[PDB]
Amino acid sequence: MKRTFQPSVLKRNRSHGFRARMATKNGRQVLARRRAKGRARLTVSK
Amino acid sequence: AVVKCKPTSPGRRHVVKVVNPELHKGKPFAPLLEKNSKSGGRNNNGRITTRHIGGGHKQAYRIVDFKRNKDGIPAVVERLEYDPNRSANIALVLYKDGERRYILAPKGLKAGDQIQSGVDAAIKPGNTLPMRNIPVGSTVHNVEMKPGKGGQLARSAGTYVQIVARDGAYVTLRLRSGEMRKVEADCRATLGEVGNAEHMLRVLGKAGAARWRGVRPTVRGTAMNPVDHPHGGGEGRNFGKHPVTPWGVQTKGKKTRSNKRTDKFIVRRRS
RNA sequence: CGCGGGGUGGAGCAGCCUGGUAGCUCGUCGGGCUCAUAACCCGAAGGUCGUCGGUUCAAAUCCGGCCCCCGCAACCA
RNA sequence: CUUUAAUGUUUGAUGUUCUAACGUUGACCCGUAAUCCGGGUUGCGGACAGUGUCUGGUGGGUAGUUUGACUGGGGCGGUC
RNA sequence: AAUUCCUUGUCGGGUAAGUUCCGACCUGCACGAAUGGCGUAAUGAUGGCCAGGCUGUCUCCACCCGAGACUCAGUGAAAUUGAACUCGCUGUGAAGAUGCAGUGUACCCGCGGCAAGACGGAAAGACCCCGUGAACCUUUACUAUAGCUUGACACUGAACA
RNA sequence: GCUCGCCGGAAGACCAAGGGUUCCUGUCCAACGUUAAUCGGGGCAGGGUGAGUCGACCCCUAAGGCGAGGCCGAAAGGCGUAGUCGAUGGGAAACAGGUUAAUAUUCCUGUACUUGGUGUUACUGCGAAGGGGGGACGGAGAAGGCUAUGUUGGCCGGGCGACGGUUGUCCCGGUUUAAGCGUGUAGGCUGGUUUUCCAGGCAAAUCCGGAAAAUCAAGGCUGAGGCGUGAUGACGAGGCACUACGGUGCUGAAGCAACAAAUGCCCUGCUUCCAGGAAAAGCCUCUAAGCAUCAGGUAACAUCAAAUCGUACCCCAAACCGACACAGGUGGUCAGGUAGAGAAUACCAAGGCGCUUGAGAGAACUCGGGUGAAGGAACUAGGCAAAAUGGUGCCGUAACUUCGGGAGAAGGCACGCUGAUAUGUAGGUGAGGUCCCUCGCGGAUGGAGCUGAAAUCAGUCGAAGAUACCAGCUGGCUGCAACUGUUUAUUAAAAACACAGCACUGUGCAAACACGAAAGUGGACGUAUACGGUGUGACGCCUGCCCGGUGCCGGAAGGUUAAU
RNA sequence: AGGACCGAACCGACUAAUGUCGAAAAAUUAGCGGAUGACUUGUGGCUGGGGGUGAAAGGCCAAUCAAACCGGGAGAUAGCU
RNA sequence: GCUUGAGUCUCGUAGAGGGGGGUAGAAUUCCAGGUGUAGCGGUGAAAUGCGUAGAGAUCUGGAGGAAUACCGGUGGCGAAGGCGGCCCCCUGGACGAAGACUGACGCUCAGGUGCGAAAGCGUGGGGAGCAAACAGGAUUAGAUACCCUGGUAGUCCACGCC
């Protein structure tokens, strides 16, 4: 069974990256809430 | 030509391939070829705008000159090439001043003959000139719609448009559907119909013969579900409806000619 | 069990709905036409209105019971 | 009052012609090495087309809902 | 007959025996000609029927070989559970009783077994019905609506006939 | 440590992906491991990743994304031009041995190579966002010639062997060698060169292209392997020497021939068919704008520079993904001995393991298997499951048919080993010798050696000779669907769907239609022999009657009829 | 040449059995079907919730689908338990 | 070997002989516009159909398809079937004239092969008129016949089949 999560570093950052979020207004709405909870891990990055 | 393949296998016993032993088996001209990526129904928005299109084989785009603007230059035909993007074959042509260009090949066009454009050319299938210097009743093709565009009508295999009459700056044409259309007389045409007339006789045979071609399987509405198609429904092939398209507009009898800006050019509708 | 429809000259069918008077075709009897039959033309008779009661001035007719016949329903587990 | 004849006038329904509005997913040149676009000559149509507003018709493509109850279980029939 | 309710209709063939199968008869409840009809070689992890070959599937199981089951040592769960000094029968009863009544019987307590019961355990029944519940879908249910289409007004003007 | 057993086209050795110190070492055993544990991927401490040639970054580009202006849209935002990113693509350059507790085409030893800066010298015209060439390509099939690699032989070293033989047709072990450079083969491709002119390539061109001529018959280009060299070098069986008894130092013979042979290489070839098979840049080359005693270009030589980042270990699994040290899934390369068609399979080499609960009993019963008298589907919903058939060559093969098939139909015969034909044949390869030559990696000629089917006859062992693994059940009737193909991932794989074909109808291109408030795209850089919709669904014989109800289309006169 | 045949790797999942608090939240075992094509597969993108996709089952869209998940309307409403 | 067999060569004649490619007018149907009015069409009689939305009729223009009045004749050609408006190109056969030439090359012919009207069939176009099937209206005892109003396949063409 090919479990529903075949890992890929490159694809992760092309769809969940930091700068990937800074693209649209909706993305900046994400980090708004992320910093709202004072979460140390803003987004999956390196 | 027409050659029935021997019934050696299920899927081959109905294949009739067109044999045209005049096509150059060599490699097509490099400078006259550029790429044309596939999209298969997808568009700007990425939706499947048009169904049953995709997959298929890879094919490089050919530059066919419809304008043929060069005047007073004889053209020695080089060879007949095969064309994926068009049902009509293309003839590699060499001008007198040494330029290689492609043209849609008429009926009697062999490897090496001559053609010429402008209003100095007489009547030989392949000659190009405005229809205000043409004999009334000539069989032509690659006729254009606007003075200088290049060509829009009569381009497929075995297609020919018969010039009915000529009144001033308007030529009474007869398109292939038989729909009389008055086009501006300042439009360039090409004598002689397109050959390759055995194209109709070609019968694929295999479903794969359509798959590598570029088509995609069409599913009937009588099998689908009401949520996906207006026909569907029922446990046992029920119909009871007026056959309509996947988008509600009625078919099998529904005229959709609403142009208004070109109504003046249609003498009689196609019949 | 329940719903709807029908039963009218010898046969096949109108008429009923909006109650008093019954029609068409065929068929039968009789005549003519022909050597003769059929066909055709002409003339006429023939209907307990399935069955009984009730209501009404009056019942094929309106209603109900009964009999026969036709179609539908005779179900979901 | 009816039938009517000419003129002045008043809007309206068509026909054809015309070019400035406008359309131009025609050609050419330039911005510009750029099949986008904008503009300038020219060509082709033409007061249409297309669009805004109001309105008749169509419309299960789509949306929101309705689709009675009693009933020797409900349904059917029947009934209120 | 993928269709025939009645019906396993009737005749003939295959079996000693045939509600199936095969070929015909037409009384087709309710086949039928692109919501295609009748045939059709080949193909088919397709359906039904039959024969040969070969076998434990069967008459009826018998034995042997390995891993568990079993014993010892180490580690060590789970479903479930009001409380139990937790017997059979006859009757009674929210109507099929281990517990009430009557009577009979039975030393206390383990392990391996087997599953008739404890209407055993698991899923606040999927069946039926209800709620002036929801959700999708249908159309000649009601009212609206995108789209399409019609005419007028405006962008939109000059002329004569 | 000694035996046994297991995988071995993997349960092996390494990379990409993806984890992130799990790698190595010492120490410790509470917690972690379904058991103990001085063991360990557990805790604690220390060490380890060394690059101009590997990869990435970088030069360039596709699908596609963002997108100066701009078009459009309540706003957000959407789209798109020039550009700019984005590889799974293309583009410069290193191989061998040794060395560590762990890393090495990275360090060391030896031997080569690439791209630029700068300087000097001898010469010469150079020169873009522009042109041309090149880059640059499909599938399948067949074939020649080699290599990886392996066996045998020769030679070299050792032994002659605890039970009968073994100094000989005996046994075991080794017999390894690259990048580059030079010559430039098998084989493949293309006719070279010189002169003139030109509406052609946005401009221009000496580059390309076309069109006329002359001379001669070759030249040029591409190209595995071999042969030399690289190397009187390294490695090297086995000894010689010290043992912390793990290993280290030193020394060291042979190192060739032949045959067989890849899916690797030539091949990014050739033939053939069709469904007709990226782009750009590096490179090469030509000019414009211009600069010219220059700057620069070409060639040689010297020197300098080649940065940044990853580099440990696992990588078909106890380290990724499945909550677990989980019988699952994971792309790619190399891939030997024997039989065998084969990467199947059985047994083995290299290499890596015995799967982290065992000791007894051998009960019923349960799971995986073997065998079974007589009979043979009598079982049952049903021949479900097992059983049996199963290879190659040859003999031979029906109804029907679209004349391809059906078909490997069905049904049978011979298969071991040895000898003889023949001190192992046909066939294949091919040294030496001989001759010639436009002289080399040449061609005829010649045939040793080596390798090696199969057929025929005879003899002989056994019940059985495709003796194991492996390896079709077949025939007859017939429904349905043509067929290969597709689907309910996780109860339905079929007659359901798709299918080429046929039919109707829509559409004259700013086409219909679809997405989208719009712009703009798809359709299609296609255009009626085209495209969209629907229905049926190979082929063959055919496809009747109805225009009432409903829908569509045509004609609009009249009645009715909103806005104004 | 072939949507050709037999048959590994490979892809899929028809039959039977084991398993069902399993070794595993669909696998193993012994047989199967395709296996040069309508093929399989890696890397990298595009299409998105009344929308996407679909050789069309109302199957698939992170083990969940006749309408995904998450937050907020919302302590929605419940004549019912 | 010689010719009275047959065949060939030199010159002309008539001809719907065949194939391919163009061309013309009359006539019919269809469409649009102008003039114009209640019938038109049809038969043995009648009716369906067509028409007051204005047909038919008449005139003008245009697009189509097939067949070719008169000449035309028991005339001509060809093996037969069959073939006729005109023209061009390619081309077969028969006949007559006066001679020459080869020297029996002749005749027929199971099997075999080829041609072959119409109807019919397939693939692809064309579609005016005519008209199976079918439909309506009459006639009729019945009329799925004869009559009339329409009308698909076919009839035409290129390539094959029978």
Domains of chain B, start order: 1-113 (2.40.50.140), 117-194 (no CATH), 195-271 (4.10.950.10)
Token readout for B181 is 């259309």
DSSP, res B153 = B
The amino acid sitting at B120 is D
Per the CB < 8 A criterion, the answer to whether B19 and B198 are in contact is: no
* Largest Cα span, chain B: 71
The pairing of strands B180-184 and B165-167 is unpaired
How many residues does the structure list for chain A?
A: 46
3-state secondary structure at position B143: strand
Question: Of B76, B75, B158, nearest to B111 (Cα)?
Answer: B76
Is the shortest CB-to-strand distance from B226 to strand E under 7 Å? yes
Is the shortest CB-to-strand distance from B169 to strand H under 7 Å? no
Is the shortest CB-to-strand distance from B9 to strand E under 7 Å? no
Output the CA–CA distances (angstroms, integers) from residue B218 to B55, B83, B213, in the order listed: 14, 26, 15
Taking the mean position of all CA atoms in its chain, how far away is CA A12? 8
Is the shortest CB-to-strand distance from B20 to strand G under 7 Å? no
Token readout for B99 is 């330029």
The amino acid sitting at A26 is N
Per the CB < 8 A criterion, the answer to whether B121 and B189 are in contact is: no
Exposed, middle or buried by CB within 10 Å (0-12, 13-18, 19+), for B118? Answer: middle
The distance (Å) linking the CA of A25 with the C1' of F167 is: 96
3-state secondary structure at position B102: strand
Angle (CA) B184-B190-B194 rounded to 5° is 125
- What whole-number distance in Å separates Cα of residue B61 and Cα of residue B33? 6
Output the CA–CA distances (angstroms, integers) from residue B133 to B74, B192, B193, in the order listed: 19, 15, 18
Per the CB < 8 A criterion, the answer to whether B187 and B169 are in contact is: no
- What whole-number distance in Å separates Cα of residue B267 and Cα of residue A39? 74
Is the shortest CB-to-strand distance from B63 to strand D under 7 Å? no
Is the shortest CB-to-strand distance from B236 to strand E under 7 Å? no
The amino acid sitting at B35 is K
The amino acid sitting at B99 is E
- What whole-number distance in Å separates Cα of residue B147 and Cα of residue B83? 27
- What whole-number distance in Å separates Cα of residue B162 and Cα of residue B174? 5
Output the CA–CA distances (angstroms, integers) from residue B145 to A26, B64, B171, B201, B242, in the order listed: 48, 17, 11, 30, 38
Token readout for A40 is 């140390």
- What whole-number distance in Å separates Cα of residue B253 and Cα of residue B12? 37
The amino acid sitting at B225 is N
Please provide residue B157's backbone torsions phi and psi, each rounded to the nearest 5 degrees.
Answer: -65, 130
B193: alpha, beta or left? (left if phi > 0; alpha if psi -120 to 50)? beta
What technique was this entry resolved by? Answer: cryo-EM
Indicate if the alpha-carbon torsion angle B208, B209, B212, B214 is positive or negative: negative
Per the CB < 8 A criterion, the answer to whether A43 and A18 are in contact is: yes
Is the shortest CB-to-strand distance from B227 to strand E under 7 Å? yes
3-state secondary structure at position B242: coil
Which nucleotide's C1' is closest to B54 (Cα)? F522
Is the shortest CB-to-strand distance from B209 to strand G under 7 Å? yes
State whether CATH 3.30.70.1150 applies to domain A1-46.
no
Per-domain boundaries in chain A: 1-46
Question: Of B23, B7, B32, nearest to B196 (Cα)?
Answer: B23
The distance (Å) linking the CA of A6 with the C1' of F10 is: 26
Is the shortest CB-to-strand distance from B57 to strand D under 7 Å? no
Please provide residue A21's backbone torsions phi and psi, each rounded to the nearest 5 degrees.
Answer: -75, -35
Q: Residues 233-252 of chain B: which lie with beta carbon within 7 Å of strand G?
A: none
Q: Where is A33: in which H helix or E strand?
A: helix A25-36
3-state secondary structure at position A9: helix
Is the shortest CB-to-strand distance from A14 to strand G under 7 Å? yes
Rg of chain A, C-alpha, whole Å: 13
Output the CA–CA distances (angstroms, integers) from residue B105 to A23, B70, B77, B97, B102, in the order listed: 52, 17, 10, 21, 9
Which bases of strand D have any atom within 7 Å of the beta carbon of a protein residue?
26-27, 43-46, 48-50, 59-61
Exposed, middle or buried by CB within 10 Å (0-12, 13-18, 19+), for A32? Answer: exposed
